[PDB]
Amino acid sequence: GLVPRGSHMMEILRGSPALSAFRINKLLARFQAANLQVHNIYAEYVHFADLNAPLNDSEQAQLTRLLQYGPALSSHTPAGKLLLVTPRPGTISPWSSKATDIAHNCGLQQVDRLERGVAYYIEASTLTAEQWRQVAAELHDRMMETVFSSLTDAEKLFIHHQPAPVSSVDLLGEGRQALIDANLRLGLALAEDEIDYLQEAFTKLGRNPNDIELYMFAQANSEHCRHKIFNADWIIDGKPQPKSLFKMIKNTFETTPDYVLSAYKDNAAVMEGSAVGRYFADHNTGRYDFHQEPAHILMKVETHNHPTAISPWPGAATGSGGEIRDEGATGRGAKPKAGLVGFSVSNLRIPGFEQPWEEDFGKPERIVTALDIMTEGPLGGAAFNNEFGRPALTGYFRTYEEKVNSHNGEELRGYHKPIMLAGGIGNIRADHVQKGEIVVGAKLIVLGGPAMNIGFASVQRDNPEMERRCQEVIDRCWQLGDANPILFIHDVGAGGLSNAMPELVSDGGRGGKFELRDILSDEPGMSPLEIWCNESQERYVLAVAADQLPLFDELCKRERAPYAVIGDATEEQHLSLHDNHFDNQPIDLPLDVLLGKTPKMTRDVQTLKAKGDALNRADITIADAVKRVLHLPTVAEKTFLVTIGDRTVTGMVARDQMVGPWQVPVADCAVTTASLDSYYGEAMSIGERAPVALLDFAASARLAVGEALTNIAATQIGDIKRIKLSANWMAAAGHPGEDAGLYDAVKAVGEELCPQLGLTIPVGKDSMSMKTRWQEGNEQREMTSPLSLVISAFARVEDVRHTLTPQLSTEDNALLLIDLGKGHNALGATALAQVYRQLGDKPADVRDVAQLKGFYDAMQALVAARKLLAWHDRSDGGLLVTLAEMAFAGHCGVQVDIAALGDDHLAALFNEELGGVIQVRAEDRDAVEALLAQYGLADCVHYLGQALAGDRFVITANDQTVFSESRTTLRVWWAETTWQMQRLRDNPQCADQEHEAKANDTDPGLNVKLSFDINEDIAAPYIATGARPKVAVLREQGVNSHVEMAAAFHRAGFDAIDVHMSDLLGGRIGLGNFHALVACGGFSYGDVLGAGEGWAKSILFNHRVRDEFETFFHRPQTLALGVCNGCQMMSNLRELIPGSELWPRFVRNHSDRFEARFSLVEVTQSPSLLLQGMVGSQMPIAVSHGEGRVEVRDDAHLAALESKGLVALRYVDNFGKVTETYPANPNGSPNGITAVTTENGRVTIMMPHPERVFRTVANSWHPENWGEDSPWMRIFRNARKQLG
Ligand SMILES: Nc1ncnc2c1ncn2[C@@H]1O[C@H](COP(=O)(O)OP(=O)(O)O)[C@@H](O)[C@H]1O
Ligand SMILES: [Mg+2]
Ligand SMILES: [Mg+2]
Ligand SMILES: [Mg+2]
Ligand SMILES: [Mg+2]
Ligand SMILES: [Mn+2]
Ligand SMILES: [Xe]
Ligand SMILES: [Xe]
Ligand SMILES: [Xe]
Ligand SMILES: [Xe]
């Protein structure tokens, strides 16, 4: 299929069927519902290659082959009306970026660009032209895609427009009116004083401004970029105030500077970490080693609220993507470690599952629903974290939408504009914490992706693999230590380059001169304004000395990170942009003019305070309340948000959300090890309580801080002054009451509580227009957010191993409540009130700052001394939920008495005051109570009773039974929300299976059987000789699990060498010098054209590297391992490997969802040399994949594979049987297959990651008796011994 396209040819190639049966049934169903009478629906990927030159037979076959991928779904002969869905013309999909990379790396330079569409074939035959538009509408996303009638209509996707010229705004010719006209025409959003400043500046300069200069200025003076509210002067109830919001936040550093290395000066904050073994490959040798040095800790938290409202997937993806850039661009280069994720939305209103507090209040047409946000956003955030390679380990998710009598009377409050929140921690070297000086003549570089027309203007675009490559360069740069060439670095975000690059020279006291046509652009029609000010993703800006440029270029080429030198730093503090194409100068400005400031804002405002009403209990019974609270999404099980995101990459994850044998997602905070050779680490927690702010601003803010503290407290940290906070403020500024509440709330934490507790807030952010207006009848409606403080806490951890969870034990035990509420038992703005459509009266609050600190200190004392069996704090859903979730995590019963807690049982069970339940050994109860009394806690400590074996959740009040149910019943109710979300988002069959397994109380949870001694280092005689065989640790662009793979081979006595595919293509390395090869995990080319395919095919279609791999595998004494992406790649090179004739392929999981699980496997009999001695063993292992379903050609292949004895690992359920039920088997592989070997055992591929869990501390659940090494260490030691 080959056609003309301007001065290019366009090829059209068939692809594979695009829809699984269940996806088809969903479409047919939606069609029946909208009363469209569609008889049948079929879809098929189709691919469009824009060629700059012709392809020969050989190359034509190669391209065709590249585009045969995916599940082998049942194919069909097209019938009915064709509707072709493609990206919007003038847009380039991420798929296209990555697939085009692969063509290039397979030596197909003739391919200018590849793009994909989906051809739908609809048989209805009944429909009107209007109804076909309704069909067309179901089949695509209005914001990213369009629908065409013809395969040849795709030629619009590749039109090249002539570069548009710069456009001047005629101030000198029209006066002020021209600036007014441009302010509306270009949507610049300028204030009148901003327009005056510009009129004057350009009038002084004596010439007309260019559109680009105005646009740059407007986006730098947005509330988003300038933060005027946060620096404003205040008058509140007629009294001027001495400090701005920012000043009140800095107060916390002024009063608590301890441990902080950088604050308010950079893209992230930095605090002291620990001296540990930092593991990476030297520039010199390419050998990986430990570098004993300080690994200091950075932190940042960002939001992406507006874009998530319009296009939730890319909005959430880029929210995280931008924040990862911030982290990497801290100092002179740093390394992201773990992530966090947050969502706030209006009511879900799940079809079929509507809850008694949900009311449809309508919404704007321009925005998506709450349910669409929670279906697509989390997938997008996960897309970035998974494809980039950072584990997501903590998060919140709240739903709120209600008509409530709050500070400005009866109003709608909620999150029609949602919160989407992404943050993380990273590590940084001491000597890179400070930004270097920008030397005059410094080259100014853009690192990363090409410019496209992105910042419809709120629909973002993510390419995480691009950012990954960029990060490898940054890692190459900090790993050079004091030879790091990065003088200064900054992320590119709002305002794109028009903000980032003046920001950069300015921070350095320099100017720059720039050349527009040096910037990498994929859209040649862009105006200069568009090149300079677009908000395209995956870009950094930096300065490097001219003489380091040859180093920076070797680094980038080898990682295949694109970059451009676009200008020079000048002594003179001027900004210039030249254009070689139009031989002119779009920007010619002094910086003090460009960055000059209009007067600061003054806000002169007044307090509103809701009275709010006492809770009406007419319809409330304790039993009906328990059922309702557990069906509040805020309370309810969060699995749909957790298993979609990787939790194990880096091999440093110690505590993830999943807890215990039953992997229940209730961990109160995240923890990571500092290195792969220490038990020191880092921790993260979140606290958050917005609804309280509808009654009381300050209390909500204090509660957010306190809850972060209670969520982190059972971690071994020590001094509270180690705990550092991000404060992210969401508000409806201007909405009556909100501004005074904002001031009061910032003061409450900045001026008071945080200083009193010794808590620093060294980073933060604000998002100041959390409101939505639209027309419903011909009446206007507003949905206004509560003031929403989200606190994230971060800390150096002293000992990762001493972390407690909510997992109860049934040994002889005592359950003690710490009620920091002190009997107040407030019910206002609780889960309980919400769920009976009320706000209620008095909310919770920090009641006693000294006791709050006493609590933290006591907990630390008990954690260090090992005096606790379990911990869970009280938050949403109260003590009731706290106890229920512990019982869930411990798979046991609870027997408690709440008589000492008041006569008001409702209020005792459902208040959301601070505190928690501790479990201790019965024999320690007195000593623990005595210690808590020593820190002043006596009167709020209450003995409750005990955890017991069994399924009874029982609550008494001396002789009366308050509440009594099956723990399992409660646990299933608590799961219904995630079940319903999984059911409508994923393969329903899988969601139901997962849900239904939870109802079987007999589930023994994860358990282990070992055929060998986990502590016996069978490699030690060999290590002891000092002879260290090399292992080729092989990575392709996009690979992300290589450091921990290398660390595992290293512990077994290997010299791990960093072999990038570019090293093999450039002849710098040759497999002929190795006896051992490992292909690592990740998302090479973002899995595009099928996970592992581009990697493998770039090997195959380069005949010289192809031969290198064939020769290796054909030698008699070589060994190879392929894990995950590497398992996939190797399965796609089968032709090079002897004894692999029967091997399967690996394709989309049956669930149709990325599965990040801790899965139980067994070791099966096979020739596998790496699995020697382990056969019969049953242990859990890290699973992180979207495309691991084993697929065979037919039953004959499967039988043949099986009878040859090549299957090496299988998934089993917790009862220990081979299973295809989900998630025990996360991907749907036949016979539970997840590893296979060759006839001679010398090559083995597996989908799970043993390299992520070779340390016991990096197993989510593990038996108490295991030492440093897990069972999976034996794989690597088997390799060592086998080489001999
Ligand atoms: N949006 C999210 N993404 C990832 N994990 C989340 C998210 N929301 C909640 N979680 C995780 O689910 C578990 C339960 O969350 P939640 O009940 O909100 O925690 P808590 O009540 O302790 O503040 C926690 O381990 C939390 O980190
Ligand atoms: Mg100190
Ligand atoms: Mg909770
Ligand atoms: Mg908690
Ligand atoms: Mg919380
Ligand atoms: Mn009191
Ligand atoms: Xe300007
Ligand atoms: Xe962490
Ligand atoms: Xe104790
Ligand atoms: Xe290996």
Residue numbers in the entry: -7 to 447, 467 to 1295
What do the study authors state?
The native crystals of StPurL protein were exposed to xenon gas and it was noticed that crystals derivatized for 5 min or longer at 40 bar, diffracted worse than 4.0 Å resolution. Moreover, solving the structure of StPurL protein crystals (StPurL-Xenon complex) which were pressurized for 4 min did not show any increase in the number of xenon atoms bound as compared to the crystals derivatized for 1 min therefore, 1 min pressurization of xenon was used for further studies. Data sets of the xenon bound structure of StPurL were collected and refined using both native and a mutant version of StPurL R1263A. This mutant was analyzed and was found to be structurally identical to the xenon data set of the native protein (2.65 Å) and diffracted to a higher resolution of 2.18 Å and therefore, used for further analysis. There were no significant changes in the structure on introduction of xenon and the StPurL-Xenon complex was found to be isomorphous to the native structure. However, X-ray crystallographic studies revealed that none of the three internal xenon atoms were trapped in either of the proposed ammonia channels within the protein instead they were bound to select hydrophobic spaces within.
FGAR-AT encoded by the purL gene is a multidomain bi-functional enzyme that catalyzes the fourth step of the purine biosynthesis pathway. The FGAR-AT protein from Salmonella typhimurium (StPurL) has 1295 amino acid residues and is a single chain protein with three major domains. The C-terminal glutaminase domain produces an ammonia molecule that is consumed at the coupled active site present in the formylglycinamidine ribonucleotide (FGAM) synthetase domain where nitrogen is incorporated into an FGAR molecule converting it into FGAM. While the FGAM synthetase domain and glutaminase domain carry out the two enzymatic reactions within this bi-functional enzyme, the function of the N-terminal domain is not clearly understood.
